[PDB]
Amino acid sequence: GIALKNVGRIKKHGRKHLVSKNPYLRLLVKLYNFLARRTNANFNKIIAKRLIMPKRYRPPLSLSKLQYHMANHPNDIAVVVGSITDDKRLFSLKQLKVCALRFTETARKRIEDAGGECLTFDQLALKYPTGKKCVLLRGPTKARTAEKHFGKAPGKPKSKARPYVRSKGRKFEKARGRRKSRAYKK
Amino acid sequence: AKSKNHTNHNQNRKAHKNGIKKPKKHKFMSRKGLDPNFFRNQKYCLKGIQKKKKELKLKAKQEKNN
Amino acid sequence: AAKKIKTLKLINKKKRNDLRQRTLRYEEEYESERKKIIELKREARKNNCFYREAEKKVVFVIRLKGVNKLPPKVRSVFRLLRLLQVHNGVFVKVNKATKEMLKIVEPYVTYGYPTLSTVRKLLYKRGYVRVGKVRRYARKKIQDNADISKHLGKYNVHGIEDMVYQLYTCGPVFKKVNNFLWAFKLKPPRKGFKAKRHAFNEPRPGDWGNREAHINELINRMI
Amino acid sequence: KKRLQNKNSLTNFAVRCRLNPAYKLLRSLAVLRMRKSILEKSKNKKEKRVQKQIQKKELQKINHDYYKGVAKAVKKKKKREEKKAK
Amino acid sequence: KSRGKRSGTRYKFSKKFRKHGECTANKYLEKLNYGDYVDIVCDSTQQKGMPFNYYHGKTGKIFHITKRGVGVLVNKRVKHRIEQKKVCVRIEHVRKSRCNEDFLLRKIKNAELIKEAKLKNEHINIKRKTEGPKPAAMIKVPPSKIITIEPLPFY
Amino acid sequence: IDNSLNTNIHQYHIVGRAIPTAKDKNPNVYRMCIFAKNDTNAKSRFWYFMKKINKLKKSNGELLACEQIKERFPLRVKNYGVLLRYDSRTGTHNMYKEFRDTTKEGAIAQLYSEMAGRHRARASSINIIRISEISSSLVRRPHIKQLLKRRLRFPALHLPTLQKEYRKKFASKRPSTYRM
Amino acid sequence: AVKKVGKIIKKRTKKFTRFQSNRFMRVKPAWRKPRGIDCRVRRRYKGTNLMPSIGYGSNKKTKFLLPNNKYKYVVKNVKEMEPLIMNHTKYCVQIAHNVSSKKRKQIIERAKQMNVSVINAKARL
RNA sequence: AUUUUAAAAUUAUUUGAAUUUUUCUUCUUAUAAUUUAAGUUGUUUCUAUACAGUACUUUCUUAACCCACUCGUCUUGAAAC
RNA sequence: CCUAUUAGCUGGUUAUUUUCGAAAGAUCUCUCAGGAUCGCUGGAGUUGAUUAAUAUAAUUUUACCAGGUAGAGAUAAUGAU
RNA sequence: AUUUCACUCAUAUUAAAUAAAAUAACUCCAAGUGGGCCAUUUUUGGUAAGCAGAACUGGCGAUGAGGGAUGCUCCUAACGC
RNA sequence: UUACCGAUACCAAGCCAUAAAAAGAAGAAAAAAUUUUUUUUUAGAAUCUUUUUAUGAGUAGAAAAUCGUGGGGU
Questions:
Q1: Which family does it belong to (chain D) (predicted)?
Q2: β pairing state of E147-148 and F30-36
């Protein structure tokens, strides 16, 4: 008998393997696991970790946010482990070198028309195997509507969680506990 | 019928199973209900600082970018 | 294309020489300290005066009880001392803080002042070391000075004799050496205990508490 | 590396000298000191004992003083008890 | 059955023997700034601004200061976790804490000490010394005062 | 030396003293003779008596000396009178007992065995005060007095205690307790 | 008790039997984990029907091979024996139960000229 | 199949030094070997000069020493009268 | 026949190994054989750590606080006597 | 008070000690549970109770093994082969 | 006062699994006969391969990986 925590076995949390059985993504994961092991590059380690993540942690990054994040250094290349989506609110693009998992058709067309280029992660591993001049970016991992229902329960004081309701008219979840005139408010 | 009214047995070890969690102690705290006429004047202070900084930044950017 | 091995070998040779010189100086220091205490007690007693020796600065603690039925404070102190199994042994440097920690665990341990030969025996025949990355230590028997050099070399502690010196004389690098050293896993005593239930200082046979120099014979039977 | 047998660092001479580069020198010195002839010690035992007569006298004096102090405590306590008897 | 505000405070919220009466006028001159530590010691002579029973004898940090009151953040243990509680009291029930006074004096003393040591380019150890085993001492006592001790009989 | 025969009581001379404070520059030092199994137990007993008699505890004290006392003539038999204080199940009593043997520690071991045997007094209930060698003319107990005759002799009526090797299970004829 | 035949250690023989299968006919001896409440075997009372556990697992260097130090491979015709042409030293062959006498003879002769040993070589003859 | 290496120790020669002054004194200078390094190797028998036995493997049946209450279930607690 | 009505209640609830592993407190409840809710638990995932150090700690030390239980007292008060 | 510039306050042992401290923190989804009982110490009602009610910790429950002849809770000690 | 006996606990060693870690996407070795033959092997599956260390009770409950059955594509 020995008095250890968790009986002496180190416990890790989070993903350990790719779940997607996409052969191309499996090949990419193999390549970047090898790259992360054989080079010291935290760049490659981060990319190898992010290729493994669920969909909700590879959110899209719009063109406007891409070109805003890459404003100050214009000759670098931006690498996103999500998808790049178009932004109709953006009036003009400018000469972006972007590596990404996937591009929507509109975003790809706009980037090539602006004269930049779209890169896959195998091309990124070919040309910048260490990540020189490569800026790691990610989209908003907490903007999705599911997070709007998370956190403190709707009903706890000063809670911002969205409740689960069929509809959102005046007669749905809006009388008692949501205004001072009916018992209390939140 | 008659039951155990109350006990605190096992409650402490339940509490220590996931530790006695400490408050996070964030660097900044909301000033919502705190010292009006002081934090409003602090808002004015910060606005003055930002405007004085930003007009210098605009001047320098304009004169370096023609 | 072959200068690297030559440089590595030369550096190893220089390290061996420095370790040898350091160990010879250590032996001279042990002998000088023993002779000094002998002659100084002699002089004190020749004069009409008393001489009180320094406290020993380092203790060796052996756990006595198992893991069941222990108060939370005792369990916490045990974890802080790294005494997790029934016959585990550790070196604990002596100060007010550790003495007060040892007080709350006194009924479940026995400890005492180790002396140099027993320190050397413990490290040489039961000395295992925490080798790996930080928090990934992988207990390994010493068998060589390479890992001692790798982890403790920046404090010039290349060598098991350096480890022995720092443990025996509570020197500048004691916390690092003691932490680098995996907790000793001792055998049951060769002739048995007397009664783990009762204090060593009780008039009846007993084992727990501070044994002072008497820890050496128990360690020798347990090694 | 593959785990091999853990050699006894105390009795396996090669590994002991590997671990302690000074051990072979120390052991040779101890052995050479052991190998001294019995004639010198047999002829110098009295020389090495007769130097300690003064230490023996001082030792006797301190133990005598300790015994005398104990006996005087005995006498004082007995005298006090005889005082309180009446 | 009974759990009012001041339940159980018969002795804690009573003024000490010959220590009754309102606070001294000097208490109102005590300087308080944001973020400094404070003890909550309820003064039963002042009934308004009185803290709850639990916080008597607790230390906290100032998070708010009003014209006659202070808001202090106090850790309270609630089953499986601690949480900050914003207790609002009047100034009579609060007192500047000495919990870090040795820390402040240590900061000044070490400031000057390491300033002079760095001036004389000496590497000094500045941490507290946690005194443990004392060295040997060659101490002489006149034998006229060495007292022999014997266990005592029964009377 | 026969370890089956030796007991593990030794006499220790212990000198201690309170740590000098700012109140008193140098406290008076105390000395005591304590019989114990080892010097560690002797020091524990010394501090116990320091605290009980004086108001001095180990945490406020320091040990100036602790050395084992060896009997001058461990092969000369002498008579010891030992004063004693012990608490029974219903009170505390001081008594005086007499032994004779070669060492003070041996006499104390006899004392412990006899107090346990006669009064069920555990060693934790015994306080030894004042063991001292006495003269034959001042011996008071009859069981010691009868040991000091001009010529002392008696038969050997004890049963033989053979070795294990010859303690054989089946005998060929009934042995004699008369032997002699 | 463990049995050793060269490098092959079988950490236990006499395979585990279901609790009370000895004294109930409706309880077959095939092992089932006693879920129970006061179940003796589940509680690991002394002197009854010990349960299998992973500790009994055999050394994985010698885990699946037969007393001939060869892994068994079951074949249904002559075409399934091609891979053994370059595994003849570490694999032995066994003819499937439902193979007729001609295919059996053909398999035996092909295995013999491939010098691959056959386990059930004398079946249906 | 590019650390069972290197080092360490030992033996035999070898250069210088040191010292406790030498037939196990130590420190390196070089070479050659060894293992005390760098987790068991050798010899001789037998099985046996057989083709399945009285041997060896294995299943089963019987004993013998020690141990072993009836499972499932509700229950704080079931072998439960 | 509606109807396989309803049951906060009793009974039952079917392969293996491996890993983690409780509660019998609490708040509300026409609530007291029930439920929701918190706590305790698993699984999933991210952020971190992977740098013998920071976060951290049912531990001590140093410094500083708060207390009226044991004891004590009855001539300090009150209430007894 | 905030903002910007200065200057610089141990770190080469870490602003006290010790720490298989990141086996962390956080989020999500969800199970079972929500009759407990026992021992030491404290303790209320009761003449008392293997009685009823509480406090701390450890257990039994959910757990075998060695000992206590026997024994859910005692002692040792917790469990791969 | 000694010696001894005595656990599924402790110690050394082996093996199984769990957790973590170090690391990894190409060349002849031996033996037996008689320079020539013969016998073995001559590896490279990434939820994989090699090696290392620690660890292993468990009801209710949870998960993973495995084992089977009827039927359907291939």
A1: Belongs to the universal ribosomal protein uL4 family.
A2: parallel
Take residue E114 and report the two structure tokens written for it: 């390491």
Q: Provide φ and ψ at E37, rounded to 5°.
A: -80, 160
Rounded to an integer, what is the distance from CA A50 to the centroid of its chain?
Answer: 9
Binding partners of D (≥3 Cβ pairs within 8 A)? C, E, F
Determine contact, residues A61/A138, Cβ cutoff 8 Å.
yes
Sequence-ordered strand ranges (E) for E54-104: 58-65, 69-78, 81-90, 94-96
In a 10 Å sphere around its CB, with 0-12 CB exposed, 13-18 middle and 19+ buried, how is residue C184 labelled?
A: buried
Q: Is the CB of D55 under 7 A from strand K?
A: no
Of the candidates D66, D69, D74, the beta carbon closest to that of F130 is on: D74
Distance CA A54, CA A20 (A): 9
F4 contact to strand K (CB, 7 A limit): yes
From the CA atom positions of chain F, what is the Rg in Å? 22
- To the nearest whole Å, the CA of E106 is away from the closest chain C CA by 20
DSSP F20: P
C140's tokens: 């390994």
Rounded CA-CA distance A94/A72 in Å is 13
G24 three-state secondary structure: coil
Chains F and A touch (3+ CB pairs under 8 A): no
Confirm or reject contact between E153 and chain F (CB < 8 A): yes
Helix (H, G, I), strand (E, B) or coil at D46: helix
DSSP state of A144: S
Q: Where are the beta strands (DSSP E) in chain A?
A: 61-62, 77-85, 97-103, 117-119, 134-137
What is the token pair recorded at F101?
Answer: 């043997």
Residue with tokens 């907490």: A142
In chain D, which residue's Cα lies nearest the Cα of F133? Answer: D71
Residue A33 to chain C, least CA–CA distance (Å):
20
A3 touches strand K (CB under 7 A): no
Kindly report the number of other CB atoms within 10 A of residue C201's CB atom. Answer: 22
3-state SS record for F34-100? EEECCHHHHHHHHHHHHHHHCCCCHHHEEEEEEEEECCCCCCCCEEEEEEEEEECCCCEEEEEEEEE
Cα A135 from Cα A98, distance rounded (Å): 10
F132 interfacial to chain D (CB closer than 8 Å):
yes
Reduced to 3 states, what is the DSSP secondary structure of residue G4? strand
φ and ψ of F65, to 5 deg: -155, 150
Q: Kind and range of the H or E element at G91?
A: strand G91-95
Q: Is the CB of D8 inside 8 Å of chain C's CB atoms?
A: yes
Q: Which nucleotides of J are covered by protein (CB under 7 A)?
A: 1-3, 9-29, 35-38, 52-59, 61-66, 75-81
CA distances from residue E62 to E59, E73, E87 in whole angstroms, order as listed: 10, 6, 10
Helices C72-81 and C96-105 cross at an angle (nearest 10°) of: 130
**Number of C-beta neighbours around residue D58 at 10 A:** 14
Q: Give the number of other Cβ atoms within 10 Å of residue C151's Cβ.
A: 19
Query: C69 in the Ramachandran plot: left (φ > 0), alpha (ψ -120 to 50) or beta?
Result: left
Q: Do A3 and C68 touch (CB under 8 A)?
A: no
Decide if G65 contacts G8 (C-beta within 8 A). yes
- C1' of J37 to CA of F47 (Å): 46
| Strand bridging mode A77-85 / A97-103 | parallel
Taking the CA of residue G124 as centre, how many other CA atoms within 13 Å lie in the half-sphere pointing to its CB? 13
Q: How many residues does chain D have?
A: 86
Cα separation, D59 vs C10, in Å, equals 57
CA-based nearest residue to C108, from C68, C50, C157: C68
**Separation in Å, CA F168 to CA A134, F4, F163:** 95, 22, 10
Question: Residue C62 is encoded by which pair of tokens?
Answer: 């052996």
Question: End-to-end distance of chain E based on CA atoms, in angstroms?
Answer: 55
